[PDB]
């Protein structure tokens, strides 16, 4: 349609409108609000400056999106104080080489369920429970008996110690085994399916609204974006899920070696680890079924109640309620994304009539929402991992 | 089917009319010249891109605003309100009402010393016990600057810094000499001297004690900003049409925005001081290291019973200088300045290059707020309010960027700042945790 029909369709529609009101004004009554109907250069520079101004706000989401998804692989005091064990596709841990070491001089046996369900190793810790709380706790809540039975009857605890054994035996065997340790200090599982998702967002905010103030109108460009968001959102949330579990165990079960009580050079070489010299493998020692039971127990009554219902069990729609009380809002901001993608999708299936705006484009305001819903989560995530390790700094202080 | 309904569809249909003309303008290699044709009450006869009027003057404005080709969205007037007024207020944790908020037991582990405006520390009542038996001499500037320990710490500095390198480990004494002979450290130790006396002395002594920390001693001036930033919609002069259009309103925001941002960057400034010194100028008690009583005492704070505070003891001049010269060697070179002048209240610009190491968010997003704001300010000042009527002043105002985006840049600037602050306050924390392991 050439420039003629461009105007005729306007003149017709804008005439059909003005006639409709009169045709419907057969009625007569009393009312006061009767809104009844029947520079160009300096006003322009307000736009030229704004268009390029708003073109960069989205452009500064190109950046942050890539920047915020550096967690999933891409492209150092925080590093060496972070656990390194990592779940691999075969549900068996996968660890970087040369970061730990384990004394194999004693024939260690894998403590199975019986080591946990023994009526003694639950009775001994039973009194150990109040030995913490009974000092100040509400003495009416001293019914910590069933609490010991709580994790005891929880048939999930089997899978816990099982994986713990899987975390256990893997360090024993060297790098010459069919379960080799990764050579680079990093681990990475879903870096590919997300890397093709971030460049998807770029291409979306890039071409779709260079300056098409109103163009997002294909059932493809919609889906070519919805699939980008749901992948990047879950993948990040997936890390927060798996990273929470994989560090919860290495802390509750494993324990720094005490025979090498020399803490004068342990801090020393740990600094060289930051330098670039080869790492000194830190030595760990396991813990008997008694205190590992005293770990899982205390670690429950301190975390929010939704923890055991979510983390111990093993887009998520299950960790989000637990995650709520730490972060500000990784969900309310996410609503506005699912709403505009909905109302735009509902319309584009029928035939804008739904999202009317000529100031900036719609795809500019969705990507401006996605960046800020992911920012909350990562900001919320790093607070959880800081909270759980904190309690580990407390449970460690008591027994050792 | 009354006047409301019949006018509603008209405004809606004519809105779709204008927007489809835009849709019709669809060609590849989109230029950067777009139609600002929508400066009217209903655009007409713009093919350029390719009887007795009343005098009430109040119904003349609101009516003309009711029918505007571009003012056809009130879901956006709320996302401004429903989000910004809420998340701006919420993100400000420099005050709190008596209702729900997010703070788990982690607050207890956080150090608790407040900086009273008189530059003297204010400590929450009864959260520390101290060895009041030995009334030793409070430390003095010459106690540090003795020629004895300045050599000793270096001898210890080689120790912890031995496994980093040997060849490039040529000399660092001059640095250690520097951190002592600096002109300001005297305030630090004197400020450290102000710690002990108030800590050991009784509660109601001439040096007072508080019930809860008011460490957000800007709570008055910052609440006035939230009393202000609501000038968008919520406050008394809730002029619903044309939010953020009157130049009087806009200049209120900038002043109210900047005061809210410098406050937070002053809060992380301040708390960076009060955490660092206390960590390096004190230590736990080597006598009463009973782990048993320790944990039950902490957990007592969660219960709400009167907690029995912890025991600490002032540190040796040796380890303090060692801790000082160490923390002045791990953090970026800027640190030595941002920790010194804090008792000499300014500026604050020196913290920005430091904090921007962690996250690239705040240093660039904040710049994007003053830009759009200044640009929108220039827009209205160029259009003399007395010259043009309101029906057009809005349509050119929102042309400079909608409201729910501008006042949202501040949030994703503010929240971005706090998100990287808590990293820095934690970065220096475990930095000291790694060092405290050595002194133990």
From TrEMBL, chain A:
<keyword id="KW-0238">DNA-binding</keyword>
<keyword id="KW-0946">Virion</keyword>
<dbReference type="GO" id="GO:0019031">
    <property type="term" value="C:viral envelope"/>
</dbReference>
<dbReference type="GO" id="GO:0003677">
    <property type="term" value="F:DNA binding"/>
</dbReference>
<keyword id="KW-0261">Viral envelope protein</keyword>
<protein>
    <submittedName>
        <fullName>Capsid protein</fullName>
    </submittedName>
</protein>
């Amino acid at each position: 349609m050439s420039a003629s029909l461009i105007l005729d369709e306007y003149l017709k529609k804008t005439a059909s409108a003005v006639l409709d009101v009169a045709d419907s004004f057969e009625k007569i009554k009393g009312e006061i609000q009767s809104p009844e109907e029947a520079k160009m250069s300096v006003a322009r520079v307000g736009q030229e400056n704004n268009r390029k101004r708003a073109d960069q706000a989205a452009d500064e989401i190109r950046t942050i999106m890539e920047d915020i998804t550096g967690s999933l692989s891409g492209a150092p005091l925080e590093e060496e104080n972070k656990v390194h064990i990592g779940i691999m596709n075969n549900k068996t841990p996968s660890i970087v080489c040369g970061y730990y070491t384990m004394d194999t001089s004693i024939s260690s046996e894998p403590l199975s369920l019986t080591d946990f369900q023994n009526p003694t190793v639950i009775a001994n810790v039973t009194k150990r429970m109040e030995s913490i709380f009974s000092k100040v706790d509400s003495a009416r809540s001293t019914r910590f008996d069933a609490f010991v039975n709580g994790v005891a009857n929880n048939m999930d605890i089997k899978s816990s110690i099982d994986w713990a054994n899987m975390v256990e035996n893997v360090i024993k065997l060297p790098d010459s085994t069919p379960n080799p340790c990764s050579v680079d200090t990093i681990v990475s599982r879903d870096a590919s399916v997300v890397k093709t998702a971030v460049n998807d967002i770029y291409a979306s905010v890039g071409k779709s609204y260079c300056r098409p103030a109103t163009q997002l109108t294909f059932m493809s460009e919609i889906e070519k974006l919805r699939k980008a968001a749901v992948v990047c959102f879950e993948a990040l949330m997936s890390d927060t899920r798996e990273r929470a579990f994989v560090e919860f165990l290495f802390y509750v079960s494993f324990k720094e070696d005490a025979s090498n009580t020399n803490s004068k050079l342990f801090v020393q070489n740990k600094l060289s680890s930051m330098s670039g010299n080869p790492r000194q493998p830190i030595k760990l020692v396991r813990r008997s079924a008694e205190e590992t039971l005293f770990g899982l127990c205390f670690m429950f009554k301190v975390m929010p109640p939704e923890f055991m219902n979510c983390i111990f069990n093993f887009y998520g729609t299950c960790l989000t309620p637990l995650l709520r009380k730490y972060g500000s809002s990784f969900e309310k901001s996410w609503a506005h994304f699912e709403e505009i993608l909905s109302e735009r999708a509902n319309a584009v299936k029928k035939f804008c009539l739904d999202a009317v705006a000529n100031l900036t484009g719609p795809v500019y305001v969705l990507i401006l929402d996605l960046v800020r819903t992911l920012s909350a989560q990562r900001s919320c995530s790093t607070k959880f991992l800081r909270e759980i390790k904190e309690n580990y700094l407390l449970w460690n202080r008591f027994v050792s």
